[PDB]
């Protein structure tokens, strides 16, 4: 897994994209650089024991959608460290850093049924009291939580489900 080795490149790319106010461009540049890594053949070549910069060049050749200085230099440094397979996670950490910097958060809403909207208004506004960020809901439906709703933001959750009551009671008994 690559979470711990993507962190430095993610932080550096984000710092750079902030200093040049080009965050939004870097994000898609990195998305593309990630999906090239997933190609059937390239993934084979990424595993082959070729020298760093020859691999770097064969990789750059497949990208015209990279800004010809900074994206290339990122790729070439990652090649120097043989970490090109980490792009799928450099992307995620870049996205998370963007979220943290813009003070904007996503929160999941898992429910027995679709809510009534003003319910969603109260949910978001109070989560903006719980969290300082601008909160973006994305609701989902599951009949396992036969009644009420689960609020899942990040890794803090609020269990208002009847199922949670039912079992939280069951283990007293």
């Amino acid at each position: 897994e690559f979470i711990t080795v993507a962190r430095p490149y993610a932080k550096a790319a984000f710092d750079f994209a902030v200093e040049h106010q080009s965050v939004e461009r870097w994000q898609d540049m990195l998305a593309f650089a990630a999906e090239v890594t997933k190609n059937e053949q390239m993934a084979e070549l990424l595993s082959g024991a070729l020298a760093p910069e020859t691999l770097a060049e064969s990789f750059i050749a497949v990208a015209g959608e990279q800004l010809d200085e900074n994206g290339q230099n990122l790729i070439r440094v990652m090649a120097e460290n043989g970490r090109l397979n980490a792009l799928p996670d450099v992307l995620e950490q870049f996205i998370h850093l963007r979220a943290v910097s813009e003070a904007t958060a996503e929160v999941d809403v898992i429910s027995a049924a679709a809510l009534s909207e003003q319910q969603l208004a109260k949910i978001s506004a109070a989560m903006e009291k719980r969290l300082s960020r601008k909160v973006k809901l994305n609701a989902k439906i599951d009949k396992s939580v036969m009644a009420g709703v689960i609020i899942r933001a990040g890794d803090m959750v609020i269990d208002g489900s009847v199922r949670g009551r039912l079992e939280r009671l069951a283990d007293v008994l």
Binding site: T4, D155, M156, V157, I158, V172, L173
Partner: protein
């Protein structure tokens, strides 16, 4: 059994008490399962040592707060868990039932009853991991805890609040010695705690059966981590025992705790460390294993009356609590230069070295007097014993210096032959049968007998029948003096005269 009415009403009380409103909690997901360790990804607010709560009533102790993972050890059968399961971080530390009700129960290390004789009547809960009383809180140990072994209570005293290490090779009486220490405390007001790490369950059942055949079981708590239970439970069990003993200590009572095989707690902890990939030290033990035993044993203490009054909020006054520990260690091939023996030999206040040669030759208990020590020493004895045992020390020291000549003895000079036979007679005197503890009166009498030369003429092979006859004779004919000694332990020229009279009368009037 029409108590079903009560049953249903009890369930109704549990229903009524369920405070059905919610609480926010922090969540993670399992991403690995192997050999009892799970890797949890998330839990930004996990704390070290926290009890993480898995599906089913199971928990795990979070031990590694790595940069992007949490390594946690499952406290129970782990084979059922699976990748992708969800996990919650309680705020809680590991707490265990504790209190007076436990006495006579057998519990696993979570304090669930395992004897099967129903639930517990505990007095609340206590943290498993606590810090011992500071320097200012102690009080110097000056009370005896009687083992009932001539060989130990004379030459290697143990005081209330001391920490005495029983160490020796396999099958030399380490458990027998500790269980006789427990049995002897049936009447003595000391509450005992026996905590078995990594033993086979049928052995635990056997020792409990012996404690029930004697009177001792009603006095004592047994804490069990059988060898089939996971490493986390084995490794934690000594703390659950100490937390049960501190309930008594912190309330002015006396307790005695017997960690059976710290040398298996160390092994369980080694396994846990190597599975968490922590850098291994010597013999692959992780480095902190000294801290591991150090914090555990330092909790055995005697606390002055003021700390009790402060803790019990004025309810108990003028009494000093005390917790005594007797950890047991096992050494391969007598080798005392290993990692764990050398750590616990450094921590404790004394050592009882049990020797397999002495155990084979017939000397039982096999305590080796020449390398056993006790740094509380004379301070902890009754002054009759304190008076009388000094001469046994010197008799055996001269015997150990002369012993080399025993294989050329016929060539020796009678001026030394006297000593070289007195040594053998006092050594043949310290042999003792199992489950047969002696009151202090009997040990004092039997040591006085050998100290004042009465045995100088009894033949070696008869010493034991001499001793038995003497103890019977005094028990019928002179009981009030035994009552006095046992009740006070004092010593006087008066007492010495009475003893000389008893020996004179016995040696003429009775036979063996």
């Amino acid at each position: 059994q029409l108590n079903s009415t009560e049953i249903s009403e009890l369930i109704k009380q549990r229903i009524a008490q369920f405070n059905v409103v919610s609480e926010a909690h922090n969540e993670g997901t399992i991403v690995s399962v192997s050999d009892g360790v799970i890797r949890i990804h998330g839990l930004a607010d996990a704390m070290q040592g926290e009890m993480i709560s898995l599906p089913g009533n199971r928990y795990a102790i979070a031990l590694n707060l790595e940069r992007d993972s949490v390594g946690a050890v499952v406290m129970g059968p782990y084979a059922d868990l699976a990748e992708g399961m969800k996990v919650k971080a309680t705020g809680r530390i590991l707490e265990v039932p504790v209190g007076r009700g436990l006495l006579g129960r057998v519990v696993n290390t979570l304090g669930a009853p395992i004897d099967g004789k129903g639930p517990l009547d505990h007095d609340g809960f206590s943290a498993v991991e606590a810090i011992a009383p500071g320097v200012i809180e102690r009080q110097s140990v000056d009370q005896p805890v009687q083992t009932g072994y001539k060989a130990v209570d004379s030459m290697i005293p143990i005081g209330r609040g001391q920490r005495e290490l029983i160490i020796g090779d396999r099958q030399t009486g380490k458990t027998a010695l500790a269980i006789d220490a427990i049995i002897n405390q049936r009447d003595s007001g000391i509450k005992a705690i026996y905590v078995a790490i990594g033993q086979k369950a049928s052995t635990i059942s056997n020792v409990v059966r012996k404690l029930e055949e004697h009177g001792a079981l009603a006095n004592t708590i047994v804490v069990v981590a059988t060898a089939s239970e996971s490493a986390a439970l084995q490794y934690l069990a000594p703390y659950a025992g100490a937390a049960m003993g501190e309930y008594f200590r912190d309330r002015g009572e006396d307790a005695l705790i017997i960690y059976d095989d710290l040398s298996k707690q160390a092994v369980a902890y080694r396994q846990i460390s190597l599975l968490l990939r922590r850098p291994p030290g010597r013999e692959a033990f992780p480095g902190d294993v000294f801290y591991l035993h150090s914090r555990l044993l330092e909790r055995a203490a005697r606390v002055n009356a003021e700390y009790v009054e402060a803790f019990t909020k004025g309810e108990v006054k003028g009494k000093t609590g005390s917790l005594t520990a007797l950890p047991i260690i096992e050494t391969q091939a007598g080798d005392v230069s290993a990692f764990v023996p050398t750590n616990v030999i450094s921590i404790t206040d004394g050592q009882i070295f049990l020797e397999t040669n002495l155990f084979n030759a017939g000397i039982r208990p096999a305590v080796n007097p020449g390398i056993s020590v006790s740094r509380v020493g004379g301070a902890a004895q009754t002054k009759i014993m304190k008076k009388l045992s000094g001469g046994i020390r010197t008799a055996l020291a001269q015997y150990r210096e002369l012993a080399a000549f025993s294989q050329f003895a016929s060539d020796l000079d009678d001026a030394t032959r006297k000593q070289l036979d007195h040594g053998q007679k006092v050594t043949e005197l310290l042999k003792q049968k199992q489950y047969a503890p002696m009151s202090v009166a009997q040990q004092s009498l039997v040591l006085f007998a050998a100290e004042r030369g009465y045995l100088a003429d009894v033949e070696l092979s008869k010493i034991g029948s001499f001793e038995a006859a003497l103890l019977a004779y005094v028990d019928r004919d002179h009981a009030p003096l035994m009552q006095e000694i046992n009740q006070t332990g004092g010593y006087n020229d008066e007492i010495e005269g009475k003893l000389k009279g008893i020996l004179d009368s016995f040696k003429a009037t009775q036979s063996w």
